[PDB]
Amino acid sequence: TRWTPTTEQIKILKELYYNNAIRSPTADQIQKITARLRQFGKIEGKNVFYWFQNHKARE
Amino acid sequence: TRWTPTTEQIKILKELYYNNAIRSPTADQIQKITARLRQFGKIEGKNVFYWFQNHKARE
DNA sequence: GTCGTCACGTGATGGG
DNA sequence: CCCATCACGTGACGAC
């Protein structure tokens, strides 16, 4: 079904977005970010892709 | 506004519900559970009450 | 002590 | 790229 981020994963994403101004990550970045997040859960590239797109759209 | 459980809190609640068969916890238990969960976030007894009420109903 | 309902956040898409 | 929805889980109530 649908992806649900660990809070730990959210900490990583939030750190990239706010502390590092990563808002529209490139393909290379999505794959590296995905590797990082997989330590804490199942996760695909598209999960990380949609997350930045949605969080950007909403901030 | 509304409470958002951290993953580690969700680990604790499911662990009490399924592994300890606590499904309509008593008041003393609600207070004890809240104390434990507060280690991981802001939390009030009424959150834990609603959580069991909601999880029991929808299971 | 149960049920129905709301309120809201958010993952997931599609269209242009 | 950005927009607008959709899908849906779920914290909160109210009522009884």
Residue numbers in the entry:
A (entry chain B), B (entry chain A): 37 to 95
Please give sentences taken from the publication describing this entry.
The HD transcription factor WUS plays key roles for plant development with at least four distinct and essential subfunctions: Firstly, regulation of stem cell identity in the shoot apical meristem (SAM), where it is required for non cell-autonomous induction and maintenance of stem cell fate via stimulation of cytokinin and suppression of auxin signaling. Consistent with a broad functional portfolio, WUS has been shown to bind to a diverse set of DNA motifs in the regulatory regions of downstream genes involved in SAM development and signaling processes. Here, we have combined molecular, biochemical, and structural approaches to address how the WUS-HD recognizes specific DNA target sites. We find that the DNA-binding preferences of WUS-HD depend on appropriately arranged sequence motifs in a direct tandem repeat and that homodimerization is one of the key determinants to achieve high sequence specificity.
To elucidate the structural basis for these differential interactions, we solved crystal structures of WUS-HD bound to TAAT, G-Box and TGAA repeat probes to resolutions of 2.8, 2.7 and 1.6 Å, respectively. Interestingly, in the case of G-Box and TAAT, one of the two protein–DNA complexes in the asymmetric unit contained an additional bound HD, whereas both TGAA structures only included two HDs per DNA. In both cases, this additional molecule inserted its C-terminal recognition helix into a major groove of the DNA on the complementary strand of one of the prevalent recognition motifs, but did not make contact to the other two protein molecules. In the G-Box structure, this extra HD was stabilized by crystal contacts from the neighboring complex and thus likely represents a crystallization artifact. Bound to the G-Box probe, the two monomers were positioned head-to-head on the same side of the DNA and had almost identical binding features, probably due to the palindromic nature of the DNA recognition sequence and the negligible interaction between them. The binding of the “atypical” Extradenticle (Exd) HD (PDB code 2R5Y30) to a core TGAT motif, although very similar in sequence, also shows some differences in the hydrogen bond pattern compared to WUS-HD bound to the G-Box probe. Notably, the conserved R38 of the N-terminal arm in our structure neither contacted the −1 nor the −2 position of the sense-strand. However, the guanine at position −1 was specified by R94 in the C-terminal recognition helix, following the usual mechanism for HDs contacting atypical recognition motifs. In the G-Box crystal structure, Y86 formed Van der Waals interactions with thymine of the +1 position of the TGAT motif.
